[PDB]
Design a protein around this ligand. Structure first.
Ligand SMILES: Nc1nc2c(ncn2[C@@H]2O[C@H](COP(=O)(O)OP(=O)(O)NP(=O)(O)O)[C@@H](O)[C@H]2O)c(=O)[nH]1
Ligand SMILES: [Mg+2]
Lengths: 170, 79
């Protein structure tokens, strides 16, 4: 119908696949090396549910030593892609810490999010699919299993977030 | 030797930890590999007072902390 802009912020622990997911969506390319991110920004225009969406994607730092100005980009963000790795139970538990910080920045319980489980191409799963479903349903957000190595669910994860941002777009 | 974070704009935005010893050539090659593998670019400091190009042996981290200067580093390409 109309042109819309969405500010997506990718959020999660280090080595979880935040950069690899974002680069897959922007460049259709999988990054191999593990380069710890500080704050990376991207812009890409797509069509979601029959409307052109200007997506402004902000890939953020997972390492706490690289995440100084977290409060400022959590203010500017409209939706949050909370990524964990299914082979890393620690990054799954950190999700609640990111969840609460985002609710404190926006100061509301109604913050659009999408829970993302990455590295689904690996067989060494330590987080079952139902564990994340309980956490997602307890938050009231969708859960998407993605693989940045094979592009699985990458488009669905970001597009679902856009649909989650529309629910609170005024 | 110390490290600091620097923001770079290009046409979209990257913040990276840069060494006190990193030259402009190393920074450009780092930014080029971060978005275009198989790696000619130039780095500019931009203020409201004017623009200026950094030399190859120059250290952008030391240039940054030399700034009443809302300067911004920009990566550019002649292509
Ligand atoms: N098998 C597999 N490896 C992945 C996947 N996504 C990322 N990786 C790998 O995991 C490592 C971390 O990737 P990265 O995107 O840097 O994670 P990050 O969340 O951005 N890290 P940081 O928080 O430091 O910026 C890299 O070696 C990358 O190749 C995935 O879906 N599957
Ligand atoms: Mg990264």
């Amino acid at each position: 119908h109309m042109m819309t802009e969405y500010k997506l912020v990718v959020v999660g622990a280090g080595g979880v696949g935040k950069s690899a997911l974002t680069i897959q969506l922007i460049q259709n390319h999988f990054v191999d090396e593990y380069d710890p991110t500080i704050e990376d920004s991207y812009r890409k225009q797509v069509v979601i549910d029959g409307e052109t969406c200007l997506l402004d994607i902000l890939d953020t730092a997972g390492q706490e030593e690289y995440s100084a100005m977290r409060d400022q980009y959590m203010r500017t963000g409209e939706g949050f892609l909370c990524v964990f790795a299914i082979n890393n139970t620690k990054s799954f538990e950190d999700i609640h810490q990111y969840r609460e910080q985002i609710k404190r920045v926006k100061d509301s319980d109604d913050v659009p999010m999408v829970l993302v489980g990455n590295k689904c191409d690996l067989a060494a799963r330590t987080v079952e699919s139902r564990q994340a479903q309980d956490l997602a349903r307890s938050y009231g957000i969708p859960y998407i299993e993605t693989s940045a190595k094979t592009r699985q669910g990458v488009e669905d994860a970001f597009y679902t977030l856009v649909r989650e941002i529309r629910q609170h777009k005024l | 030797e110390f490290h600091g974070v620097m923001r770079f704009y290009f046409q979209a935005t990257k913040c990276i930890r840069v060494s006190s010893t990193a030259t402009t050539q190393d920074v450009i090659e780092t930014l080029a590999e971060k978005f275009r593998p198989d790696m000619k670019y130039s780095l500019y400091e931009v203020h409201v007072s004017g623009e200026r190009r950094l030399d190859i042996d120059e250290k952008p981290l030391v240039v940054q902390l030399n700034w009443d200067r809302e300067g911004r580093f920009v990566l550019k390409n002649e292509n």
